[PDB]
Amino acid sequence: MGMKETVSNIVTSQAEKGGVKHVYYVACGGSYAAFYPAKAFLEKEAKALTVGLYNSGEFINNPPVALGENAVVVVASHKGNTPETIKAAEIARQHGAPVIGLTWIMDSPLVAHCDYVETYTFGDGKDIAGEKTMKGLLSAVELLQQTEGYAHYDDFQDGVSKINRIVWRACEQVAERAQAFAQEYKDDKVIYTVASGAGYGAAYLQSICIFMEMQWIHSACIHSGEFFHGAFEITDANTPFFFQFSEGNTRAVDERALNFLKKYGRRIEVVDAAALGLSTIKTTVIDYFNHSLFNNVYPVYNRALAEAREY
Amino acid sequence: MGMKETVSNIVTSQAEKGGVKHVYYVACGGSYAAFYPAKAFLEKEAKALTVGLYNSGEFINNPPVALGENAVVVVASHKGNTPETIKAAEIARQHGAPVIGLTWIMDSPLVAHCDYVETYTFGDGKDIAGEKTMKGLLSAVELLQQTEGYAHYDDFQDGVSKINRIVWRACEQVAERAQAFAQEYKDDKVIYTVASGAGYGAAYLQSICIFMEMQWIHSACIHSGEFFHGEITDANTPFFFQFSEGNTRAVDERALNFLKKYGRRIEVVDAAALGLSTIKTTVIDYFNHSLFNNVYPVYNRALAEARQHKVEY
Hints:
Chain A: It comes from Salmonella enterica subsp. enterica serovar Cubana str. 76814. Two copies of one chain form a homodimer. The first copy, chain A, is α/β, with parallel strands linked by helices. The interface between A and B is large, with 57 and 60 residues.
């Protein structure tokens, strides 16, 4: 309802100016990675909207020439006080781009620099359907639906209705495996992550979480499609792989990579979205729900690992 | 003039279909990183072209709905044999998108699935104005100029006319420093790289070069803007720092100041110190990649030598 209405307000306001033609997602840290699904969505699905995903520091120092009245800028900062992101919202407003801000803190400094503010669920036992990543995706879904039309809108809303129950089931499902993982890798100071597709940002965040636990070296988050092109970590006989096995249209890319790692006898912890019940969401939209699945299941593993030893 | 007649041919053929509206750069390995400047160029400069940079495997398994007669696909494979990339050209042609192929081998399997084939300079002694990265960039520059117009076209071409000289002079300039670097880091198992902006792909490729030399861990290629938002550990890892010229120099300078303040071990390669600044500030961002990608081998050779002694280009 909320994001739908916000986008309707924007489509109405910008109509006389030639409408919305460009979407920018601008954030730092976890908030940047959490916008990756929205970027993947508009790249896959749009024919008449551009999409850009920027780090806030890059955006404010090097804004695109298309920033103006035919752009919408979506910013995110959990506490609403990330300075570069506040400056991004400000520069957007000065160029006449409507700004949607995503934040947990509704009286934070960010909110003064946004045209529209949306919040999200957060913390233990949140409703996933309303989490930050989902609100970012809904901005994209609505902007597409309300400008060009989106053929899989109903399928998408069906996915939104399902993701919470899928995630809480999945967290229960993995409890046992998480304990064994913790035992197997509690002494591994470096672990690579592997992923592809619209959920890649969740794997990147997991590579950060591993670094934070192990406090040694921040290692590559490898794209599945790079095995034996640019990704020669497979020649690394020491370092294990934490493998995000997606559901949807890049699953075959992941499967090829996983088969390679298996053929080399590497140590792999596989987290499989298909094994965890994501496939009740329709094939037309499931790519976009990988992030929400993995980003909310990995804490089970990370907590177990910790015990064995900017959002 | 790399790409100009090819792009003219495409802009002519597609006009009746509604024109070129979408550009896709599709590759694996080195060739993917080499297209990052073209992606950054169209993101900054275009108002009516979309740009997408894809890994070939992702592209063939999950092609965008805009892949059709209003798209152009630029694929690259050095030897012209990369199966996923060949398949990407094939799927593009099935959807009616013109395909430009970049390869060094002009009778390779790739060529049979491209509408247009372009090559590039390669090997020691290469002319940077013609190198693969520069061909990628000129595809973007020419696609922009011939569809919407590009305000800084002449400045860009002036940069092209300067970059070979800049690069080869810089390689000589850093020779002594590369020897000292090699002695200082010959026993370092892991080295982070740091960069931002249109030259980020060169830093990413350098992270692979370091991993291949040291054969320990492939460490993060850290974006300069993400040090304030994602830590110094006991490992005391050193940094190979790419200090750009142009619009993200201020982002890099913030990170550099932080590393300096905590007394980290840093090897700085600074585009302004290496002569890049004769290129106009309107276009200089786009020449960082070509500079660093061609200067780092000086450091990497020296490191290999100091230690006694696969990747798709």
